[model samples]
Target chain A: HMSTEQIQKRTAAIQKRIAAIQKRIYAMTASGMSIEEITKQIAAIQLRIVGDQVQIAYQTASGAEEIQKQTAAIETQICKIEAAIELKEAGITSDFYFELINKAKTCEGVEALKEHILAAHT
Target chain B: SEVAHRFKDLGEENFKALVLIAFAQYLQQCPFEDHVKLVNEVTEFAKTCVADESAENCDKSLHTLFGDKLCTVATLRETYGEMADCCAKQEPERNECFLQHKKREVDVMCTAFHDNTETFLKKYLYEIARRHPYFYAPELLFFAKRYKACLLPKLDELRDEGKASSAKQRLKCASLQKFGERAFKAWAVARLSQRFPKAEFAEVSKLVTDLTKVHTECCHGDLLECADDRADLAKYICENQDSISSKLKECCEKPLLEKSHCIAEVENDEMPADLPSLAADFVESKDVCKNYAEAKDVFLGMFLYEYARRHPDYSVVLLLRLAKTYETTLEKCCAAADPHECYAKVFDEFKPLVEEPQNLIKQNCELFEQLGEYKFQNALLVRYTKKVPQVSTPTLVEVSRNLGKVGSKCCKHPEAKRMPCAEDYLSVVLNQLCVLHEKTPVSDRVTKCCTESLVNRRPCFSALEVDETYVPKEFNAGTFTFHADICTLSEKERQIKKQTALVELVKHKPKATKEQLKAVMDDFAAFVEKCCKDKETCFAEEGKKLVAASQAALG
Candidate 1:
């Protein structure tokens, strides 16, 4: 999750740009020109300003998406660390070794098939 | 060439006499030209015609004939007509017309007559001085005294004989009548001087005085009474009649009359019964006895009192006319009587009226402006950011006072201050007043509060939109999982509601642009229609039926 400070900072920047856009619009409206004439000019400015805002939002959202990924990765790493500690503190080492050997033997079933085929070909 | 030689051969005395006569004829044609010059020329010639020293040398000569037919009157008239025709034809020299009279010896006779008259006057003067110096009084006193003693008895005998002679008495009577007429003429001019102080009093006064002097001389007992003085005075009066009439007319036409009328109306008790009728009547009627003249005096008094009692609002045109009329009347009255008295009357009767019209008109004008100002204020409140209709303002009194100032853009100029007239309803004044009332501080709040509390007005709150995606998870799962429902509900609601949220974005849009909100509401309404149509989606048929029944009941 993004920090409150980060969200607030981004919001403030967006607000500043929005205020600038509003100011320009007001100035154009007050220029004593006709609305039809001024609207054309304002529409162009609006397109650029709104486009910039959308770009800014996208960039800010990417940062939030990265933060989510990092949080999920960090949680998975903590779970692994806790399991390793549990294993290291166990007292019955021999039984644990036999269980580990059986687990290894089960993983060698797929490995033995590949090793026999190589021997037959040789 | 022969004609030219004939003119050169003409006798100098005849030529001079004919030239003088032609000059007199020319002057008569252009009668309005320099009066002093004409008078000087005529007087100078009269002197030469009767100088006393010359009279002694002409005793036996026909040249001494200084009577009526000194030169034939018919011939003289013909000469005058011929001279006028010559002038009209733009003749190179006036001498040519006199040539005709010289052939008949009329020119020679004219000269003889002129000389004889001059000699006669001088002799008459000397005789008068010798006989009755006191009668001559101031001029040549010693001779008049001597002449009076020497000729007193003879002069009396001649006067009695002249009175008995019909021919002589006729002339004497004509002269005597002229004397009385001249006296009346002097009296008229004197009255005019009293009326018109600013007018050229000296000229009119001199006319009266000169005519009187000539009349006295013509009536003196020794001389045959000549109609010359009487004819001259008549001509003079006729020539200047226009100026006299015009002055009187101008005086009577003054604006003070209208002001006097207004005053009469205000002071109803003092006002004459005819005054109201007179005010309107005067404009149409030319006679003083009619309503127009009566209204003039009535208004003059009203103006003097500085009263503002108008039946209808006074137009700027009327006010200006009033001022001009006042000035014109004063001028005319000054010419007709004692100028000083006329001026005094004008000041006494008119100044107050002039001063008061301005304030009264100004007050009404300002009232109009205040009303417009109020209307403008009201418009501001009613419309707010949504611009109200253009509120016209009242024209300022000063700007309106002189209609000419209305269009000037210079701020310092009077017209720039005048408010523009509005298109609809009352003037800018009333419109602005209405606007002011609407926008006045506390007015809207008081109105709104009163409307809400006392009138039970409804608040026009925005319509709500519901998102179809928002659902209870427990109901979907066929179990009441409150925790999952709450979590799923919030997430689902966030996703769906954000898209459908009826957020108020635009404020203060022009009322003309309200169609935009209406369009949005229409779309939301369509979605509501679809939602209602989907009976299985949210409600059982029975539940829907029951809701429809409830809606029907309310309706």
Candidate 2:
């Protein structure tokens, strides 16, 4: 069997390349297909990289993702996993945690083009 | 970010202890710009805290910590809603009884109920393993063990038939479960975000505790039990010139989750111009004992509601501390043998309490005037973004832009009109934020403010949890980069074009230390003065310098 040293060197090399890729992607905005591609790329290397404590996986073939009487759409099966991840991370079975992320989605942007609702608004 | 690691050293028990201690101080007196000062007060009281429910410090804490001013046995129990029965016992049994009551409190998370704990945790671990193969399996188990403890506290408290009947009480249990499950999720995410405040998180926990108390007390389907929940609420409204009678009645009728939420969403009207300030009444009122019965937690809620509405221009913690200042002044008044005499005496203390919150806004405007636009904008940018690190960096440009408007609009007025103009306009910044993040999350306050009624929205922002002094331990840059069309705008639209150029440039650039970015930007300004005014080659050569610096910074 190969020594632990070879495994370490391989990972070290893999990690360096990933770091360089991170810098290229770093200046990239979180919109269009760029962030999607960047995160997707990172997700791949993440799987290839570590047994360490932050192997953030993605969806290339990878990984995945409250409340109120909130107007939300879960879509179906992915909703279950997404909710589970949220519930797991936030340690909540409550829909409230889900609502918080629901706002930050790409995750959020209920724009257009609207005006303020109140009568006295300046 | 590293603050999340500290969680391993201190657990929930200590956090809850810190929560109780801080509330004791805020309610007992008046409050954090110097967050270290708050750290001091919390540290001192915590030594006493770490409870009748606080009996370990029988020397004075049971009497002092709960105190006559902040709450009474009657109002404390009143705030508990239906589960007021937990207060039925005295002392040693009293504390332990509430502990059991709390254990039963979380027993209500039925909405997300899995078929079994083992299956749920196995699934939970299964997801975590692939996503974070980095975390040890044992660590997942550790978290799982604690989570199930929040879940399986006891038999369903609302179950109609000896825990065996699934169908009858499950619906009511679902709402109760939402409250607990929500609390669980908040705690779960707390360490990860480290930006999540355990102290503020505990207020909701306490609110959750109060919420469950409402559930266990009213879920009996005693129609009166649920309606009785809002009796004190309605009573206070009659005192306030209220339009919420129908609203309160409507909210009080639903099951526990709907009931609690409906009531919480109902906003009260601002203090009418005709009404004298509550500060005037607090000292000058004829009878302090009459004031005593009037000043329960219910009264304090009205107190908070009134003051908060009047000052929509302030921050959340700022206004809350000012409320404490007034409330504590009343506390000191009522606890005295000669209550009116004491209240009369602390008017000096009370006036500053009133003046100090105003002065904070005054000083902010003063800085805006003195510092000019960009410097003041950067001050707001650096301080605000540091405390609330969860918000994305790019979003800060909008926040910075709105804050700059505060300076532009407010500074135009003469000195006499200036602070008032600033105060009025500061709310504009707050409202813009509410408008911007209408569906987004930043903190509990921003989330609540966006959904607040337009009338209440500005005042709600006055209470946002902000630490103007929070310094970033290390701020790794988030993405920003640009387009050439930014340079095309003529001189008349110069400011917009210049801002666009810088913003787009940063947006186009790669990760560089902020200092390196700053140098590159200064170089752009010089080069733009010489070149953009006068070639395709010039643009190309300048672009080369930009990339070289970015690559050099990272290297």
Candidate 3:
């Protein structure tokens, strides 16, 4: 029932906070008692986060397949970003990028974007 | 009277026999080669004495000239015997037998003079007076009248004028004999204390006192002085001599471990305050430092031999140092009671580091050769009695030949001439040969051992196969008359044909003996040829089969 503009503002706020929280979560998990156990927990949390994010985007969209495809594309972009984080964590990063853009394609519609923000933040 | 004389003669003969026995014992006691020289000299002296005994009535002459001297000699014999006996007894708690022996020797010498001077001096002085009349008195006035004549104012008058003033003073000084005795005794005590380490101050003082008393009477023209001062002094001198010898014995008698410990603790710095106590504790401690340098030498020498046997990386400097240390340690330990055991223990400790298979097997073949040469030189020093040559020889020759062939092969191989030592040779050869052997069949092993003998000569690759690819097509099809032509052969068929050719080569080829192999392989000219040439171009015609064979064989 909310207007598209309101959804956009909430989505942007959620997305910014989500990115900050994700970084803090990674640091917390890395500092856990066992690296392996922490990694497993992080993986499970990542899966849930990814599914929720995809669901939020698809649920808001009129075309499920198209939204899913866009979500999948975003997921791939996110994976690339995660890959870079993993490489840096593993101490294997050799290339330099000031800021890496990971999203494969920008999602269409404020509702879809809002859903992505909500899933990522939660 | 005749019976009494016979009794004396028999007693003297027995005494002589005892002296001879003691001399023999002295010879038996000495362990050094120098002792043999001394014994030979003594034997000659004894022979001369026996021969001279008849020219004069020997006993009378000796009694007249050296009565006290004979007594001293007899006492020396008794002291030597006592010392020897004490030394023969061992104590589990300590090595103090030499100390006891030296003390006894000193006591015997001192006692001999106390017991034997009176009768000896009486007979000796009487004979001296009988032999010389002009010594004691002056038929002086008649001598002055006869020599100076009345015109010379008589020699007695002139001498009287010269001596008159000093004579009283000289006589006064002479009269202070007791004072002289005291001073002389003090001097003698100090001298004896310094000379005889075994003679404690009290003992030295007592001997000096006795000597001074006799000296006073003897010097005062008292014929009844009995020459006891002379006797005592001789005894003291001889005892000091015995003490000197015993001290030397004590120095040498310390256990080898103690000496090594001393050497270990020898420091360049002035010993600090705490050092004496530490040194004392070290001396008493059981954890003595044995000479390990000796052990290291044996290890190094054997290591060199084994290494040279297994590898050709001969390090000249290392082998020389090893051999030198071994020889030195062997010489050092030769006089040790447990020399063989010591040597064995040292060798056992060193064996692993120096002679282990993997460690020694690297291509330090030059080191091995140097070690072999060192062993040969060491053997020569020991009159070639040692078996070092047996361990070193066949291997040394083998390595020499193998090295030569390696040199030759490098000349034939592309870019292999630049390889450094045998280790490099092995790395390259192993890499290349494994491929060749694997590709070629077993029949070619013999052909490879002959033509490309450098690779085939290895114990592991003696059974390598030869490829028919080794023979040119013209040679293979024409004069060779083989069913194996150029076109129709599969890989397996080619392998079989190569094997056949190798077998034929083995059958017809003359296998070089180890000696001939050494001669052929050790040629510097061949080594240069192998090492200096462009390998790829030299073997380019057969390069494919050779390369494939070498690489495959390596696999």
Candidate 4:
């Protein structure tokens, strides 16, 4: 069985790969294609992501139980990244975070502003 | 010379098509001095290509050279076929029908070209990739197979690097799109000149050149960074096509006498709706009308209005020139085949000039008055109609009162001692109002103060000056409430009392200080409090009594 450290290192490598693919997808989405065209492209990327997921699942299934848990974490991380791609296609960005940061300055106190920022992100 | 020799055996129509194809091919290589000659030569050839007599022969030639792949040529032939019956007619009537036909043809071809450029570019890039597999990496051999999907990103990367070789490659990629755009523009201009032989090709060429330039900058630059921007650029060109086509039609189809007017209308940026009056201070700064032998009535009318608006010092020479140009426009328009339609167009074109109260009063009031009471009233309504609740009711009332005084003097002045007439008074009043409207935000209190001063026969100039000095303070109910109650009194009573109070106060103390005016106001207030039971009663009974006392005291 592989050690926890090996699984962690593997998870980090998978994340780096996923990030590279996601960055390319983001660049494609921003290129100004129609929504339908972009959606089709994203669907194609999703297939690739699914292929990566299957590779992770297969690699972890042959290893220790903790490897299965790490694979699940990686899957969730990929799903979040895909959700972010959908948001980007709809013209939503992290611009709202800057708006919230500005709002934080005018907020009542540290606790209230902290609560506001947390609530907004959620 | 070789091109000419090769096409010599072909018939005139076939030869014409060959020349157009050759000219389009060598467009970038053509000398700058020879551009006009080449454009004219190609335009003449394109006309034959669209002519009913030569369309079939032109088609066969185009088909032999470019096959069905030359979509613009195919579309042009199809449009000519559809418009064949109109193209076969006699002069004047033939030209009219052909103008309509060509406008429709131009619109369809422009849109088709815009929509088909990407497809054409994809096909072109595919051919390039197929021929040159050595240029790309071994792993990127798939790009040669699927060039449409791969070449765009590769081109963009090369373009970003600003490499010398990539510049040439980029030009090669964009060449087909440019050719398609120029072909449609050239075809449209050729068809226009064929319909109106006298139409200046220079102006039409300039307009077309400008449109292509804008398109090139949009598509070739980093502005269209992505596929979405490219799609939007296509949409932008598509939307602008109708306006550009319509403008070309209007300008090219007009007779020589009125063609410049149509050109000027389309060429100039949209004129402001509220063109100020030039009557009061008319200066003969620009002799714009001198350029045209006889300016169109609408153009002359608007020119006169614009001049008077900008330079308010009156020149008799300018006025006579205006009157002369107007007469000529009317004569020409009436002489046209459809007098009613012609006059209506002229009226509609200058309608903006008359809509402004100052412009109407200064430039066209006399003409409107001469036309009849109905015309004069219509002019007044157009000038004064409140589309938005922008000007307050009290300010309008004040303006109306001032206009009456000015109108009567100018309209009925003695021959020997003619006053600066109704238009002059209107120019001053309207100018003041325009300044106030622009500088100050609209408010009830501000308008009320303006009206109160105007009703007391005071000049609007002083009232506006005071309004600027005082930033709107909170509404003083004591001050405005009394004035509001005074308005509730009968018009005659209110006018007489207000006039009498001013006369009494000013007559005894000619240069009354602020303290003295306040003392008089206090005495009047005390009398109202003692004698009147209610606000309305105080305005009616006590207001009349104060006026009678003031009149008696003044006498």
Candidate 5:
């Protein structure tokens, strides 16, 4: 099993990655990229964050071999989020993205808006 | 020449005057060209008489020069035989009176020969008939005899010649036509006036003029063109006259003060009480009827009456069957809370068919009042389409279901008379519902619910009942945030989207020909430009422009 410190370190890293994604989403939103585009990018990151949390929990319960597999899975999710960010930065736009942003704009609260963003982007 | 020399010695005037008097005796025998020849001979004779200086010798020379042709006292007496007796007195008086009478006869003959003989005859005949009624017959006889003897022979000669035959026939026909026209006019005036002595002269004159105009147009003009048809023409004219005469005689037998009143009434443009009778009178008289509207009404009335008369057996049977259907349908209406309103609703459904009662009867008596039931359902279908802004498959099914309920309520009437009124009320209520339904995005489900809920009563709703769940996602304001100020912004966005789509189509299809891509791109650009220019116009206006632009761009 991994040490608690190591698990904490990995969770912190995942949290940091999520924060970085959130910052990028805010920046893209502020830059006047359509709400849908921001929503799509943020939703992908959100899904990865959820997967990261699940993996962290798995890391806590499982042995070294399972932790490695979970870590690899989390790493792959991170790579996907990065790729999505890259696409957004490259100015690729679509109606699918616009629909997400529209839903985000009309959501009642930040939490509700996040839920919509994740649901539509995923 | 000898007479001229001798007249030169006797004071030129006296010698010339005496020579002319001598030549006057031979004027009858000498043609106008031989006047100079006869003048020369008479002048020589005058010189011989004047040289002797004797009046008796002058008279003797005149007698010798004009032998049998000379107009002596006896010749003057023969020329004016009756007038001569009237003037016979002393020698001087007799000769003066005979010469004066001869001058008058010459003037009359001159005028008659120089002018249109037919015109002169017409004038003289009427004038003589008016002034000397007793002598009118004799005077007309005399003129006719003169015409036959003098003009007929010449006309006959012209007609016999090959080249002149056509011209002569035309002249003869024209003369005869004119005489017939004038004769008819005079006869009509006299005969009509005699028949209705109390009739105003102006009225009689107008009637005669109108009849003459008809004759000129229909008969006389054609007769003049076809001279060979003169015999047939005469018969036709006589028939026309006889017809008019009989009509007038019939009119006289009527219970009017003057027979002319009846004819005058026929000529009048005023609508008559008995249009068929007036038509008969006009037809019999061969007079043109002018009251067209009245005539149409009369004919329509007669046609309907005749139709009813001809089909007595079938009409009653059909009418009763239709009446039963109406009564059965109307019973449902009378049982309603507001029977009058129900009747009005049902009536409106059949209003179009009822408007043309005759046609309704003729087409199908069985379905005469059944139009109410038939139209109620049709109207509801139309209402459903119009009231609902966007009809989906489900909405259509729902609307059809509600329509059945509304239609049954409308047609629930007990009598045919009540059906029309019941349908009228239902039509009004349904129309109101349609209007309310249009204002808001009311789904067909809500419409069906509301209509079904209001069973026997009117389907009344304060505002449209929009079902929250059934409302489409696109209809949500939050879903279409971009459409908030889309009145102007939507138009711009649409144009951009259209441009992008066209360009995308061009880029994706590699095998697409250059002309095809260019056509799509060009059409998109043109439509965008047109829409942009008239952005303030209504959707319909812009849509029409877009359709035309697309057609042109493709071309």
Candidate 6:
């Protein structure tokens, strides 16, 4: 029963939680640390997020607009994670920087690569 | 899992690629601590295969290891036919023979895996997502997209590259396999969305699950072999078409491909005018007994089918109950000494059973007009909350708002038309609730009553047990607080605040006696009357006065 503005903020907080974990997974992938297990862990968190978002849907029928927005937002994040998996298959060697950009085929992936150039390589 | 899920689509041509893919993906998902152990095992197996090494008991050894864990000796033979074939040959030329490549669509439905494309995908993807928990629907869709895109082409490329690893091929194949399912399910979801234009999202999801399951089982059989479900759907659509130009009749008559396309062009249509009422043929004595004796199943199916199409506003449960009642009635009437009178009496018996729904709708329109929308809605919520206390307030509020809107819709009509308008709209919502909340944990009393025959529903709901001996465990502070600011508030806002208090009180004190709860509501009106008159001392302890009153009443 949150106001639309409150729902927006609540979903934004969920977005952040997803982002923080996603960054950790991305860093692990770049460092050749975790692989499928981390993606599995990430997928677990996404389900919880989806479940939470779904409850919002179950709450108020009128909240569909927020639910739709949150769904799209989560969908965008999924595109990035899958593209990262595509990169994982190519091997996560240091100085494979150019290929990282090339391998990233999604809009979110390309944009995400910007902030991660500053990412410390292990 | 079971023999049913064994190397389902495994064929000699794609055997090595699929196995290696399974191996790699399994490795990818396995614990990181065992990563090197599994890698060594994989490498050892690879060397053994490539170095022209063939075990004396290849089939038995492999089967004994993973066989008890999955698949059976019989299923294993079909699954490992290629493994046996490869090991039968000796070294130097053996390696090259096993690496032999042929191309085919890996995603094609095979006899072994003919259950369904979408069915497996739903389980596979859901299992994967649950395992991965970090992925989203968007990412899952992309994987499917990539799997379809890369599968056959990459497998061909890897195999032709002189015995390279099938690693990349497997990755794309996962997507291809999953994508096959996602497309069917996704398309189904969209079509159901279109079909049930105003249905709750939960309803649509449930329908998708149902539709997917049907296809899965049906996909295992010849599509045409299964006649009942789709025939029912076709009849449901075609029989209810709106006159001569309506393409629904032709849609129902068309073959599979054309049928789907033609049906896709239609929406949930109106129940046509001049539709004949039900049960006349079923209860016409000689005709009834003849129909019942020779072909009861088909005759009853016909009765319910036309009955459903005729009364578009009524629910499936409502339609189904009547179908049962008609059979029960027919059985009794047929077995009677004077069968004609029995049939005629049963027809007369149906009048009030049908009239009950009409009567309730008229009452609802009257109530809605008498009680303004907010109070009317809050009143309904109060009635439900006490009866079904475990159901969440927000959920109850949603039902209340929906029902309130339905009641309000009919009130806009010319006074005489309101009854039919209420019947049409309320039945639509009522039907949705009956099905939608069938499994919702609202206690059997409330949930079953929702699906009760329209005649019995009100009585069923009213029959719910209440605890007159019970009292609120704790008193919550605050109804209309005698705060000075309350007098300055707008009329609508003031009314809303009181309604909010009423809702909270009803929800919190479900165990409180009905007379006690009613007095609490009356107390609010009396407090407002005195305090808002600019009376000074009355405003001082006003909020606490209601709290003291609530506290006393609960005890």
| Prediction 4 TM-score vs. true | 0.18
Candidates, DockQ: 0.00, 0.01, 0.00, 0.00, 0.00, 0.01
Query: Candidate 3 vs candidate 6: which has greater TM-score?
Result: 6
Interface CA root-mean-square deviation for model 3: 49.0
**Residues B289-371, model 6: lDDT tens digits:** 65455434434544554565455454343444566667788888789887777777665665655566556666766778898
Q: What stretches of model 4 exceed 4 Å from their correct place?
A: A1-122, B1-389, B392-398, B414-420, B441-555
The sequence of per-residue lDDT tens digits that candidate 3 reaches over residues B1-555 is 221222243233222322222222222233323333342443343344455644333343222222222222334444445544433333421123322221214345436546665333222222322232111111111122233224245545745532322232222223234234433433333333333334322233344445456444433322122132333334443334332223333323333322222221222121112312321211222211232222332122223322222222222222233334444555666557765544444433434433332243433333334434332222121221111121122232333333444444333332221222333344333433333334443334333442331212333332233333332212222212223232233243243333233222222222323333233223312322332344434333343333343232131
User: Model 5 over residues B1-555: C-alpha lDDT tens digits?
Assistant: 322334544434333323333333222233323433444555566566656655434543222333322233334555534544533354444433333332115356656667765444433333322232112121122233334344455544533332222222222233224346543444444434333333323233434455445344322212111212222222332233332223344544543122322443332121112324322322222211221122222222222222222222222212222223333434565466754444444323433433333332233223323544333333333334333434442344344334444445433443333333333333344433443454554466445533442221232321333233332222212221111123455464343244333322322232344455456445545544444453445444544554454444232
- How many clashes in each candidate? 75, 29, 35, 11, 31, 14
Model 1 C-alpha lDDT per residue in residues B463-527, reported as the tens digit of each score: 11221232212121211111122223334323223121112111112232244434433343343
lDDT rank order: 6, 2, 5, 4, 3, 1
- Please name the candidate that would achieve the greatest lDDT relative to the true structure: 6
TM-score versus the correct structure, for each prediction: 0.13, 0.32, 0.16, 0.18, 0.12, 0.40
- B96-127 in candidate 4: lDDT tens per residue? 34224311153554465467754433333333
Q: Across residues A20-108, which tens digit of lDDT does each residue of candidate 2 receive?
A: 55554454323121234345646754664554212222222344301211212222112322322323332232232233223222111
Consecutive 10-residue window with the lowest summed lDDT within model 5 chain B:
B285-294
Better of 4 and 6 by TM-score: 6
Give the distance in Å from residue B482's predicted Cα in candidate 1 to where it truly belongs. 99
Off by over 4 Å in 3: A1-122, B1-425, B434-513, B516-555
Q: Residue B508 in candidate 1 has what lDDT?
A: 16
Candidate 2, residues B1-555, lDDT tens digits: the string is 111221223343333222233222222222211222443343445444441215344244332333322233324544444434545555555433433432123444443354565344444434332232222222233343434542333323322122212221232233344344332222222211121121122122223233344334333221122233333333332322122223455556554334433454454323245646655655565643453443233234334444444554434434445555566767776777887777676546645544654565567778787877765765555445533544545566567667677777776765544544554455545644654565466565467655554334444654555444333333223222233444565353454444444443433333334566557656656666444572445556666665566566543
Which ten-residue region of model 6 chain A has the weakest summed lDDT?
A113-122
Please provide, for model 4 over A8-110, each residue's C-alpha lDDT reduced to its tens digit, 9 standing for 90 to 100. Answer: 5654666575666557586765451233443464455456556555666777787523345445444533443443344344343343222222222111212
Candidate 3 on A4-122: residue-level lDDT in tens? 45545534544564475468447855541133433453455456456655555765885532233433444434443444344334332222110111211221211222222222222
RMSD for all candidates, in order, please. Answer: 57.4, 31.5, 47.0, 32.0, 55.0, 29.5
The lDDT of each candidate is 0.30, 0.40, 0.32, 0.36, 0.37, 0.47
